[PDB]
Design a protein around this ligand. Structure first.
Ligand code: ZN
Length: 37
């Protein structure tokens, strides 16, 4: 849904706390969270 209330992309994972607007960035960012050890 384009209109209506908007939603922000926040790191649901307990640890981070940044802000995102594009979902495509979530993937690139997710790899950093999982790809650690
Ligand atoms: Zn994060």
């Amino acid at each position: 849904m384009d209109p209506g209330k908007k939603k922000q992309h926040i790191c649901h994972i307990q640890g981070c706390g940044k802000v995102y607007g594009k979902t495509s960035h979530l993937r690139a960012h997710l790899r950093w969270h999982t790809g650690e050890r």
